[PDB]
């Protein structure tokens, strides 16, 4: 027995289900069954991602797009609103406009990352059994990969923490989901980097997976001096949540982050016999292109081409881009000094090989962002600025 009452379920109890059946009308009281039918669909038909996400934030009419009215019920000391237009320089006719092209609400997000979680462990259990680590270049594995690819997790970790204020300050649901999903993927990259280092330590005796050397390198090694100053500024120096997302994903991570992860560690892993690292970089690069898809729709479709504030936003985006591009160029100028420590491989680590790598990063960046906000950039000038820090 029990002290309380064993409640009878109305769905199955014959007496209560009969009462419920008598109370339920034999006809529907309305034919509109589309959840939040009034949401303006971005695509041919309204998607479940929009129905579950859009208009969840209770914005009033004095925040562009809000369907509510009145002031907030409780505000900060001094009078700062719960959400307000003072949180960003950018302006729009409707903050609700943003649409993640991947259409990720929470469930498809964790479903896709659960697949990566479980499959990673099956890969590692088999990779350790394969003993493929025997063919890796030992110098690249111990002196370059462990020390500096481990130091790069702090760049990923710093970008993740930049989103702390963005998740509180941004003014619409779909943007908030974009930022938070982008934040978890960044801390994921930081952990997956440390995950690989722990894994190599299990296969290579003497391989120290401690973060002491990567942390000392991230904080004192001049190779990461430019990158560290940039992330400390994007993370803690500013609070304009649009500036943080733009400077973070569309400038720094799109230029320095892409070069370090893909043009250096991922690429050079495939010239130094490293059969393990491409498994991890395959995830971070997948996160980038997925994050880029959402950031591209926020700043290009919605902001840089807002029907009323398009040029107004591009004015700030240009000022932001010009500043943080100089930071990333200075960060890349420091980073190419790491090529002085790697084994010389023709077409990859020589001056011609790094030049073509910088032309890929800057050329793609001009196409993916600069050309979409009217930001002029001489790619040849930016390549030569970074190659100034390269040792022949």
């Amino acid at each position: 027995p029990q002290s309380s009452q064993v409640t009878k379920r109305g769905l199955t109890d014959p007496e209560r289900a009969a009462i419920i059946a008598a109370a339920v009308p034999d006809h529907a009281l309305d034919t509109q069954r589309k959840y939040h039918y009034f949401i303006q669909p971005r695509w041919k038909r309204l998607s479940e991602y929009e129905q579950l996400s859009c208009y969840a934030q209770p914005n009033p009419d004095w925040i562009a797009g809000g369907l509510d009215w009145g002031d907030w019920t409780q505000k900060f000391h001094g009078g700062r609103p719960s959400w307000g237009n003072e949180s960003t320089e950018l302006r729009t006719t409707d903050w609700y406009r943003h649409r993640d092209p991947a259409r990720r609400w929470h469930h498809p997000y964790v479903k896709d990352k659960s697949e990566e979680a479980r499959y990673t462990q099956r890969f590692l259990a088999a990779y350790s059994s394969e003993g493929s680590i025997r063919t890796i270049d030992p110098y690249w594995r111990d002196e370059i990969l462990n020390k500096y690819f481990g130091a790069l997790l702090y760049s990923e970790y710093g970008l993740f923490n930049a989103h702390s204020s963005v998740g509180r300050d941004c003014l619409s649901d779909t943007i908030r989901q974009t930022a938070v999903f982008a934040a978890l993927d960044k801390v994921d990259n930081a952990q997956m980097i440390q995950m690989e280092r722990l894994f190599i330590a299990k296969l290579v005796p003497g391989f120290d997976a401690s973060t002491d050397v990567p942390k000392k390198i991230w904080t004192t090694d001049p190779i990461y001096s430019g990158a560290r100053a940039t992330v400390q500024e994007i993370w803690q120096g500013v609070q304009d949540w649009n500036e943080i997302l733009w400077a973070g994903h569309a400038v720094y991570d799109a230029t320095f982050g892409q070069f370090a992860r893909r043009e250096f560690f991922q690429r050079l892993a495939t010239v130094y016999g490293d059969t393990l690292t491409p498994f991890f970089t395959a995830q971070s690069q997948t996160y980038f292109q997925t994050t880029r898809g959402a950031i591209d729709d926020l700043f290009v479709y919605c902001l840089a081409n807002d029907s009323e504030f398009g040029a107004h936003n591009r004015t700030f985006l240009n000022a932001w881009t010009e500043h943080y591009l100089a930071s990333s160029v200075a960060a890349l100028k420091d980073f190419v000094g790491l090529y002085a420590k790697v084994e010389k491989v023709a077409g990859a680590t020589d001056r011609a090989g790094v030049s073509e790598a910088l032309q890929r990063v800057f050329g793609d960046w001009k196409i993916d962002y600069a050309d979409k906000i009217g930001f002029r950039v001489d790619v040849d000038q930016k390549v030569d600025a970074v190659l100034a820090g390269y040792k022949n």
Binding site: T12, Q289, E356
Partner: protein, 515 residues
């Protein structure tokens, strides 16, 4: 070059690799099937579903998550496990586990089609079917596995893979959807397993049963069974491609009619009376007369949409159909006599038809009350349900000349003095062994193929032994070691023990001794 490339987001869809599957096979001298077949026609056919390995895993896993979510979370929280009417909870011990061996043998039968197929798409297509029948096996297993955890009688649900060997009904099951598939012509499985097995009988066996399950409070089985049949349309698509190649080749078509009618009678000989008995007698609430279910799904739909349509291409109507229709009406009532009479051999708790049940039987089957009804009511008056009665109807049958014989081919029981369905006893002596056959279609199979049908029956194995000694040897008891798993009633008190069966003194005779 190293600077310019198309950065458009692209992948590779399943039908993009599937268009190159046919080129994966290369010609060499030994590239033929390993199993015996009489169909050697060209079968370079395409499969109607662009299924590859990664996509196959994607659809099935998607099905499972919804099914296992419904079971492990939803229905468990509702306590739906113990919401099944006792008659139907007992009937799912037989149906799910007997189907399990039909699904399990389908794994091997599909592998023969896989092996005997010549086109790379059909080999890949049958591999997917092979994988599906494994999924079906584990699904039938999961129903009983779940029933064991949340149903008020786990015995029978928990140990059917050994306690089924005690009874005679399990014998015929090892032929209808088991040995009938894997033991014969390999490519002929496109006729017995697919054209007749999957295209005709899975629809009442797997789908129509879900309505009876829900009617009797069982929402576990529909969750799983309906998800099983979602794979069946891909299975029959593979079989139909081969039947086409067989019908177009005149050298191979001269064997299709014979194999079709043989496969139809083989499967209908057991399916028609056994499931008809399980549906009507193993349920409290009836969806519809079994003969109507048979007419709708077997005779009219499958017979017309498949066999009637193929009629304009040499495929004839099965010459055993008239005899099959007589089985659709009465044979399951004949089986009820045998199944209730020999209830200690099973692994489920049966229930005699109540006064409402009898009215439903006589209304839909005029004359049931005067034959089967008076027998069931007499058994009840003799103490069929009372463990202190010492009464078991099998002894009663022999005392009145109603001997039960086992068909050497189909293993289906037959009581000629009480059977209303299709059947006549034929007893032949051949090389010092006596054989009993029941119909013109099975007898011809035994006369032509004796080495294919040397299946020992329950009387030849248990001869001269007492009933309770067989049950105890076959583990037909509950956790206490003395209470029988099978019962003649579905109540929770006065359960029969080995001693109760022993007091009846039932000893297995030799039914063919009188000849």
């Amino acid at each position: 070059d190293a600077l310019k490339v198309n950065r458009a987001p692209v992948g590779v869809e399943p039908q993009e690799v599937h268009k190159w599957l046919q080129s994966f096979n290369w010609d060499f001298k030994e590239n033929r099937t390993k199993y015996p077949t009489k169909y050697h026609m060209a079968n370079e056919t395409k499969e109607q579903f662009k299924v590859i390995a990664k996509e196959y895993a994607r659809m099935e896993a998607a099905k499972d998550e919804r099914q296992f979510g419904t079971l492990l979370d939803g229905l468990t929280r509702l306590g739906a496990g113990n919401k099944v009417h006792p008659r139907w909870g007992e009937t799912m011990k037989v149906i799910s586990n007997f189907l399990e061996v039909g699904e399990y043998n389908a794994i091997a039968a599909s592998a023969m089609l896989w092996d005997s197929a010549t086109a790379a798409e059909q080999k890949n297509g049958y591999l997917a079917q092979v994988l599906d029948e494994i999924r079906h096996t584990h699904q039938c297993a999961f129903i009983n596995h779940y029933y064991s955890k949340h149903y008020h009688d786990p015995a029978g649900h928990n140990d059917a893979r050994r306690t089924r060997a005690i009874g005679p009904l399990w014998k015929g099951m090892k032929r209808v959807f088991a040995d009938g598939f894997i033991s014969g012509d390999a490519v002929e499985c496109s006729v017995n397993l697919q054209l007749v097995g999957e295209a005709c009988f899975t629809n009442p066996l797997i789908v129509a049963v879900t309505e009876w399950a829900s009617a009797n409070g069982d929402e576990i089985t529909p969750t799983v069974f309906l998800s099983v049949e979602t794979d069946e349309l891909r299975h029959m698509a593979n079989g139909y491609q081969t039947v086409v190649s067989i019908a177009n080749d005149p050298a191979s078509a001269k064997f299709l009619n014979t194999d079709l009618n043989n496969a139809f009678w083989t499967q209908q000989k057991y399916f028609t009376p056994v499931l008809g008995y399980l549906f009507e007698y193993g349920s409290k609430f009836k969806v519809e007369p079994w003969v109507k279910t048979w007419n709708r799904w077997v005779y009219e739909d499958w017979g017309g949409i498949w066999i009637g349509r193929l009629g304009k291409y040499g495929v004839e109507s099965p010459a055993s159909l008239r005899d099959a229709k007589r089985d659709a009406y009465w044979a399951h009532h004949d089986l009820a006599l045998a199944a209730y009479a020999m209830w200690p051999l099973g692994f489920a708790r049966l229930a005699l038809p109540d006064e409402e049940d009898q009215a439903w039987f006589e209304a839909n089957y005029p004359g049931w009350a005067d034959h089967y009804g008076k027998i069931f009511n007499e058994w009840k008056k003799l103490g069929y349900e009372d463990p202190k009665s010492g009464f078991i109807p099998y002894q009663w049958l022999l005392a009145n000349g109603h001997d039960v014989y086992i068909d050497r081919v189909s293993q289906v029981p037959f009581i000629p003095s009480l059977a209303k369905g299709t059947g006549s006893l034929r007893v032949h002596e051949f090389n010092g062994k006596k054989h009993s056959l029941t119909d013109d279609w099975g007898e011809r199979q035994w006369l032509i193929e004796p080495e294919r049908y040397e299946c020992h029956n329950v009387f030849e194995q248990y001869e001269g032994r007492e009933l309770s000694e067989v049950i105890a040897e076959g583990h037909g008891v509950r956790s206490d070691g003395k209470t029988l798993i099978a019962q003649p009633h579905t109540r929770g008190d006065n359960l029969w023990t080995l001693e109760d069966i022993k007091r009846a003194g039932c000893v297995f005779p030799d039914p063919l001794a009188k000849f």
